[PDB]
């Protein structure tokens, strides 16, 4: 999420905690700036490694004060940790105690590791507590910097994946543009909708990559980038679904362009955008009003209805084409049906695997590939889009589908 924090000290209970997966040899910097001191301060910090990812997931800030005691009485989850505490009589707002010239303090469940560093890439929990000895007085700035300026783990693979996807979509666009240019005398609206889909995918990937670059080099995410990416993704998915429905219905390929076919039937099927969008932005906001739990039910219902309709229509159209004795289009429709079947099977298998790999054990022992749940869908969509592109490639005899 973030790699730089600003915290005015006199707030709440003064605790500051964060849990996240971190690289190895990552340093944590604390800086204190503000008005002249009046009172003495006592700063205590804990940095704990986590063996398995459950602890980070179910870490509640409001109970941190209690959590610590469970850690101290030797009853918490397994994992080594470092603890330290220092006392300043008026203010050490200029000293560099946490910067350099430190000592080697032993770790607890010797070691003699660096004062404030990560000794192994894993899920870490950092807690800092400021006690003032007897309205703002200070403003603590906290940063984490590792081998990469601000890009923690769990984000590096995602950034690389988005870069690769951007390159792939650029290649898709270049190839489609070349084919279209070669044969411009005749074309079909489907070959324009495909290009629009490619363009939207390119824009989504570019936005995501730029946002990740900014987060890496500045430590803060851009406020209005996730929303834009989600909206673009929803638009692209809705357009692809509508295109598939139109192709299956045979509108303009096997039957005359009847008006009723679109009106009240297909275009209304664009409400799938709303729901698809509705959850999207909410997922960015964190599901604060917890409707995210009751958000995917309408989406699943709509997807089931659309699949049922698509398969019924495909069977009807293929039967009609076989009866008509046409041969050229029959092979194309057969390949289209096979591709759809394979996509459905892959989606089912992926859902089963994710469910059986995440909600199956007390706590995940393999958090490294925890990002795959947010990347398989995009790869599958890219594969489907490439197959469709190859099927409907403009050619010299691009008139068999009048
Ligand atoms: C309260 C305790 C129980 C709760 C389980 C909550 C798990 C969170 C993930 C939800 C999920 O399981 O994901 C959804 C898939 O449907 C399902 O629900 C799975 C089968 C069940 C059918 C209702 C949404 O994903 P989608 O929009 O279909 O993916 C397409 C996107 N292109
Ligand atoms: C092998 C290794 O990393 N050794 C490190 C060294 O790089 C670093 O300059 C020094 C500073 O405390 O601590 C030790
Ligand atoms: C800071 O608070 C701790 C409480 O854990 C207590 O030992 C003392 O007041 C301070 N610690 C020092 C001065 O080492
Ligand atoms: C703490 O000691 C004095 C006493 O008030 C204070 O003025 C100063 O800023 C702090 N540091 C030192 C070295 O005196």
Numbering used by the authors: 38 to 146, 168 to 192, 203 to 470
What did the publication describing this PDB structure actually write?
Although we investigated the ion conduction of TMEM87A, we could not identify an ion conduction pathway beyond the constriction site due to the presence of the R2-fatty acid chain of PE occupying the hydrophobic TMD cavity. Based on this, we hypothesized that the lower hydrophobic cavity of TMEM87A might be a potential pathway for ion conduction and that our structure represents a non-conducting state in which the lipid chain obstructs ion conduction. To verify this, we determined the cryo-EM structure of a hTMEM87A mutant A308M, which we predict would block the ion conduction pathway at the entrance of the lower hydrophobic cavity. Indeed, A308M effectively sealed the lower hydrophobic cavity, resulting in reduced channel activity compared to that of the WT. Interestingly, the PE density in hTMEM87A A308M was displaced to a position similar to that of the S6 state in MD simulation. This suggests that the lower hydrophobic cavity of TMEM87A is a potential ion conduction pathway, and that PE displacement in hTMEM87A by the external energy, such as high voltage and mechanical pressure steps, could affect channel opening.
